[PDB]
Amino acid sequence: NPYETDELLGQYLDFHYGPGHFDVPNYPKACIEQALAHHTGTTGRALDLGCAVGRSSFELARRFDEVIGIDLSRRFIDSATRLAEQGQLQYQVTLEGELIERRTADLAALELSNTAGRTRFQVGDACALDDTLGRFDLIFAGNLIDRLPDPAAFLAQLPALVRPGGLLMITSPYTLLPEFTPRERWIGGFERNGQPVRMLDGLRHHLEPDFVLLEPTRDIPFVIRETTRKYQHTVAEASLWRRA
Numbered sequence: 001n002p003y004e005t006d007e008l009l010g011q012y013l014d015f016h017y018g019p020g021h022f023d024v025p026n027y028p029k030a031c032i033e034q035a036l037a038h039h040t041g042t043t044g045r046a047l048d049l050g051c052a053v054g055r056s057s058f059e060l061a062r063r064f065d066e067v068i069g070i071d072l073s074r075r076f077i078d079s080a081t082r083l084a085e086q087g088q089l090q091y092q093v094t095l096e097g098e099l100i101e102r103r104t105a106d107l108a109a110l111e112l113s114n115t116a117g118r119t120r121f122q123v124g125d126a127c128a129l130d131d132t133l134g135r136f137d138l139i140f141a142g143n144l145i146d147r148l149p150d151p152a153a154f155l156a157q158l159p160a161l162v163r164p165g166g167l168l169m170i171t172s173p174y175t176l177l178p179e180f181t182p183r184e185r186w187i188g189g190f191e192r193n194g195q196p197v198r199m200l201d202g203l204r205h206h207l208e209p210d211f212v213l214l215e216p217t218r219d220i221p222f223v224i225r226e227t228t229r230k231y232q233h234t235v236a237e238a239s240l241w242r243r244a
């Protein structure tokens with residue numbers, strides 16, 4: 001699992017808690033700002049699936065009474081929990097080759113410490129969530145669907161996990177790779193009967209009519225830092241879904 005490596009840990013801690021790159025706003029925060037601009041229901045409980053090191057969960061906790069963050073990576077979850085409990089952590093990022101630099105993530109500097117106690121992070125599989133998880137006013141899944149081995153199994157849980165009137169938000173650049181998703185399990189990104197099936201088409205097929213797409217979808221860009229000089233700069237599609 002690459003998400004258990006130090007290489008990815010430093011990249012994702014900078015992604016979630018570091019300074020911006022190329023003047024692009026922080027992505028977990030930008031995503032939750034859009035979710036909160038559209039949630040018209042109660043604010044008791046939110047779920048952050050594939051939460052990584054937790055920035056979107058802490059942002060949700062500014063408004064929700066309880067926020068549950070779930071990720072398969074124990075190293076990611078241990079970092080999110082240390083941030084919730086200590087308010088700070090330190091990590092390394094790559095400068096060039098073996099040359100590295102130590103950095104700090106700080107909830108208080110981000111105005112996130114006061115509500116960190118509303119979060120709870122746990123290791124879990126988003127394709128097979130525990131049956132004790134209950135249901136939620138809001139569910140966020142950022143950059144997750146194209147990293148799952150069984151997207152259909154993931155999506156099949158969501159109607160039961162969102163209260164009617166609640167909000168589901170999915171973001172993805174749709175970077176489909178057999179290393180992450182077996183081709184036979186793709187829900188889009190191919191032609192069928194000689195016509196294109198986009199990932200968004202697959203999302204609609206699996207979620208409608210239990211969910212209603214709040215049209216139109218929105219592009220949200222993001223920048224991941226790999227070295228001092230190398231970055232990924234990608235445009236995710238955000239789709240917002242109201243539970244019927």
Ligand SMILES: C[S@@+](CC[C@H](N)C(=O)[O-])C[C@H]1O[C@@H](n2cnc3c(N)ncnc32)[C@H](O)[C@@H]1O
Pocket residue numbers: 003015028049050051052053070071072073076124125126127141142143144147148149
């Ligand atoms: C591309 S990252 C997105 C992280 C974060 N939501 C963001 O937008 O920065 C994908 C995340 O999904 C997690 N993940 C992958 N497969 C998972 C699974 N089956 N169940 C739960 N989390 C999973 C990875 O550990 C990683 O944190």
